[PDB]
Design a protein around this ligand. Structure first.
Ligand SMILES: Cc1cc(Cl)c(OCCOc2ccc(C3=C(C(=O)N(Cc4cccc(C)c4C)C4CC4)[C@H]4CNC[C@@H](C3)N4)cc2)c(Cl)c1
Ligand SMILES: *[C@@H]1O[C@H](CO)[C@@H](O)[C@H](O)[C@H]1NC(C)=O
Ligand SMILES: *[C@H]1O[C@H](CO)[C@@H](O)[C@H](O)[C@H]1NC(C)=O
Length: 337
């Protein structure tokens, strides 16, 4: 029973400003997993005990042991995800998942097949998709949908705070926002359509001049992405405008110049969201002989979602983000650290 004022929160660990994860329990008694909570996908994945020790990504992560949960219920429906370095596959199962003290009976994918890269470099063990049912593999009801159907949470919204690496690493609130991690007020932008946390963008400004995305473009708000990302060509333009020169997959500046780079502005719902140099350069060193990388990368996202920009941890660290299902909209407020 609720009296209409209940929320719950999940505390996150920050790994290298690139991976932000919380812990959830699966089964009875609970088996614990480190998971990334990801607004750009809608399925729950964890590695299965039936994953072969010939898969290097399985060898060094927590595996889910179905035989040890009294509440597990067999399903077996094969599941497939194309990933750009190979195919990940596994089977469907059902059990009880515990998140922020809430218990939910949930379908999830047990992974039995995984490329070694990039998955062996994950600090976390799995993924909890916070996207819409419309994009769920095998159309299974996502975890937040199940949570809502309980009618326990104050509002049909969840929010994300991501800290700079140092101190709380981040926090997800289910059913509200935490006024301690943001300042001032929320502005909201409506979603282009239901089924994806994607909004319209009206311009990207270096300095005081709109250098990109006039005539508009799309922005995916992806809590699971490490960086702000754009199309190859867009990023070329932005980088050649910054003095940044291409390494292998990175763009680099001289660590002494970094602190004098220009602001980048994102124009979203008639408000300008500005990142300064301190927000987008990894300043490992303030030295004239060293090379510093930028938290902005190139990426070309396939249809139907793309071509699109993606506003990942780099953008979220600056702006506390509220994801509003009741009104199909996203709100931003300046985060406080
Ligand atoms: C160790 C391990 C790692 C993972 Cl990702 C896992 O889940 C298997 C499901 O596969 C994926 C699920 C989601 C994603 C997504 C994303 C994605 O790239 N992810 C993987 C990721 C992110 C950062 C750093 C590393 C090393 C990795 C592996 C997962 C969200 C964390 C991003 C970017 N693209 C769109 C969405 C979806 N958001 C990519 C792969 C399992 Cl079962 C085990
Ligand atoms: C909801 O609970 C919070 C607990 O911090 C309390 O401060 C607030 O007054 C409550 N609001 C309502 C609607 O009663
Ligand atoms: C799980 O698989 C069962 C067979 O055991 C299938 O009939 C069912 O649709 C699956 N659950 C869902 C809701 O996808």
């Amino acid at each position: 029973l609720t009296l209409g004022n209940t929320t719950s929160s999940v505390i996150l660990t920050n790994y290298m400003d690139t991976q932000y994860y919380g812990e959830i329990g699966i089964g009875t008694p609970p088996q614990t997993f480190k998971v990334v909570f990801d607004t750009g996908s809608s399925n729950v994945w964890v590695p299965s005990s039936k994953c072969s020790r010939l898969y290097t990504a399985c060898v060094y992560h927590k595996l889910f042991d179905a035989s040890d949960s009294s509440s597990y219920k067999h399903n077996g429906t094969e599941l497939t995800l194309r990933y750009s370095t190979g195919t990940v596959s596994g089977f469907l199962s059902q059990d009880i998942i515990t998140v922020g003290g809430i218990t939910v009976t949930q379908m999830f994918g047990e992974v039995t097949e995984m490329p070694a890269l990039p998955f062996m470099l994950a600090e976390f063990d799995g993924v909890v998709g916070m996207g819409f049912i419309e994009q769920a593999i095998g159309r299974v009801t996502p975890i937040f949908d199940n949570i809502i159907s309980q009618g326990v949470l104050k509002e049909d919204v969840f929010s994300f705070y991501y800290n700079r690496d140092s101190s709380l690493g981040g926090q997800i609130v289910l059913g509200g926002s935490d006024p301690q991690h943001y300042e001032g007020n929320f502005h909201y932008i409506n979603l282009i359509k239901t089924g994806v946390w994607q909004i319209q963008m009206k311009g990207v400004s270096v300095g005081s001049s709109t250098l990109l995305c006039e005539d508009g473009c799309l922005a995916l708000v992806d809590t699971g992405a490490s960086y702000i990302s754009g199309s190859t060509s867009s990023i070329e333009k932005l980088m050649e405008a910054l003095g940044a020169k291409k390494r292998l997959f990175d763009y680099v500046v001289k660590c002494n110049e970094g602190p004098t780079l220009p602001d980048i502005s994102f124009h979203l719902g008639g408000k300008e969201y500005t990142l300064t140099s301190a927000d987008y350069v990894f300043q490992e060193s303030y030295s004239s002989k060293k090379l510093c990388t930028l938290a902005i990368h190139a990426m070309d996202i396939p249809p139907p979602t793309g071509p699109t920009w993606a506003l990942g941890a780099t953008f979220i660290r600056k702006f506390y983000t509220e994801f509003d299902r009741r009104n199909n909209r996203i709100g931003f407020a300046l985060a406080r650290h």
